[PDB]
Design a binder for this molecule. Structure first.
Ligand code: SF4
Length: 54
């Protein structure tokens, strides 16, 4: 498999960015398996990669 981004290289933060959050993101796969970053991932999160899904 191709290597995943670290919580560094995805730009993870300890608080969400307004309305942009992991627990509402198109990438997250509940309960916790984001396709953008290494596992686990918090309910709040946000990453430095954009998505067109609000
Ligand atoms: S780290 Fe980013 S891509 Fe992954 S679930 Fe969170 S907001 Fe989505």
């Amino acid at each position: 498999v191709t290597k995943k981004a670290s919580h560094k290289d995805a730009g993870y933060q300890e608080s969400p960015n307004g309305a942009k959050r992991c627990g509402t993101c198109r990438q997250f796969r509940p309960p916790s398996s984001c396709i953008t970053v290494e596992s686990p991932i918090s309910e709040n999160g946000w990453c430095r990669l954009y998505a067109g899904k609000a």
